[PDB]
Design a protein around this ligand. Structure first.
Ligand SMILES: [Mg+2]
Ligand SMILES: [Mg+2]
Ligand code: NA
Length: 348
DNA sequence: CGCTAGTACTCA
DNA sequence: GTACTAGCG
């Protein structure tokens, strides 16, 4: 998530209703809904007790979309990104800590406190996601498990013209170069839509409305793949990018002190970290639903060697990739949990 | 004014 | 994943 991006470009947003996309196809960042609905039954999840409330919670939204003549594509997070492993470890430690503390408060008598910790302990597994997948596919709703981050997969589906809008809460979708993003959507169909073309309505951006410059800005402000230099947020990064008559981003990164008059000295590690972050935003592996193969989010440019981009996700055989995409192969255990086949009983 | 980091929150 | 803001440059 880009910390503060939604508030920074709020002039590019407008209140809409999803009836706007009647007859069209939209993709869904389902893990948001999963995280929301899991909270309704955090006690049972923490205690290990069985619960299927989040399933109905998601299917509620799904049916809401279906009622307005919309075809929703539920997209799920797949395997872990090495380039994001920091935030993943952080959140893991967080959830585990709140879990142990929750158990402690459970055996201390503290009720609401332990329940709160349980809310802050929920780890969305592929099992729950697969419950939602079966529940959705039972009603003809297409589902897709990304090879890695759902963000990149959604971005691809939107760029490929397969879907016309992305339903999510994460601002990263804009940094991935999505055209239309529906945020803050409730269970009725009311949400805030940010359009890429409307980024020009943001006076603060300046000439930083192009996909490349916008990406550079989001990265420089601080993303999930790279922490920002101390003292650098959205405004100063956008300032740097505005005051630059140079397409070569690296030289600009080095001259950040000049462009800001802040006397900043950049570490040599941060340059490579930036290269890696940009390469992750650009070339993270996604799954083609049509050709059924692992491709990068954007086509490889001639100035990059795919061999060096393992942190943007490593390749597997397209059979495995397809079985993952269908939700048959467990993301964690890598063992088969289902045997669904889109041929026997999208992807056309 | 901008940015970091801590707090609080997503359900019902 | 989010929003809010007190402390501070
Ligand atoms: Mg995501
Ligand atoms: Mg993201
Ligand atoms: Na920052």
């Amino acid at each position: 998530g880009i910390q503060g991006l939604l508030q920074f470009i709020k002039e590019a947003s407008e209140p809409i209703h999803v009836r706007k996309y009647k007859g069209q196809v939209v993709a869904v960042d389902t893990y948001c809904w999963l995280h929301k609905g899991a909270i309704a039954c955090a006690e049972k999840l923490a205690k290990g007790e069985p619960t299927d409330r989040y399933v109905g919670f998601c299917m509620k939204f799904v049916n809401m979309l279906l009622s307005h003549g919309i075809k929703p594509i539920l997209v799920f997070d797949g395997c872990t990104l090495p380039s994001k492993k920091e935030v993943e470890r952080s959140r893991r430690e967080r959830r585990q800590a709140n879990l142990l503390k929750g158990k402690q408060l459970l055996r201390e008598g503290k009720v609401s406190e332990a329940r709160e910790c349980f809310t802050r302990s929920i780890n969305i597994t592929h099992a729950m996601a697969h419950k939602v997948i079966k529940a959705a596919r039972s009603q003809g709703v297409d589902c897709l498990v990304a090879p890695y981050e759902a963000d990149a997969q959604l971005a691809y589906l939107n760029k490929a013209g397969i879907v016309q809008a992305i339903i999510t809460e994460d601002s990263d979708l804009l940094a991935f170069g999505c055209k239309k993003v529906i945020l803050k959507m409730d269970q009725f169909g009311n949400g805030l839509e940010i359009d890429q073309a409307r980024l020009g309505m943001c006076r603060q951006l300046g000439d930083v409305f192009t996909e490349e410059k916008f990406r550079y800005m989001c990265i420089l402000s601080g993303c999930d793949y790279l922490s920002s230099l101390r003292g650098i947020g959205l405004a100063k990064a956008c300032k740097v990018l505005r005051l630059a008559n140079n397409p070569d981003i690296v030289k600009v990164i080095k001259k950040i002190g000049h462009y800001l008059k802040m006397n900043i000295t950049v570490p040599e590690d941060y340059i490579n970290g930036f290269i890696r972050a940009n390469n992750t935003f650009l070339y993270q592996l996604v799954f083609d639903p049509i050709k059924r193969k692992l491709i990068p989010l954007n086509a490889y440019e001639d100035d990059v060697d795919p061999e060096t981009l393992s942190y943007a996700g490593q390749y597997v055989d397209d059979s495995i990739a397809l079985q993952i995409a269908l939700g048959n192969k467990d993301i964690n255990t890598f063992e088969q949990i289902d045997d669904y086949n889109p041929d026997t009983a999208l992807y056309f």
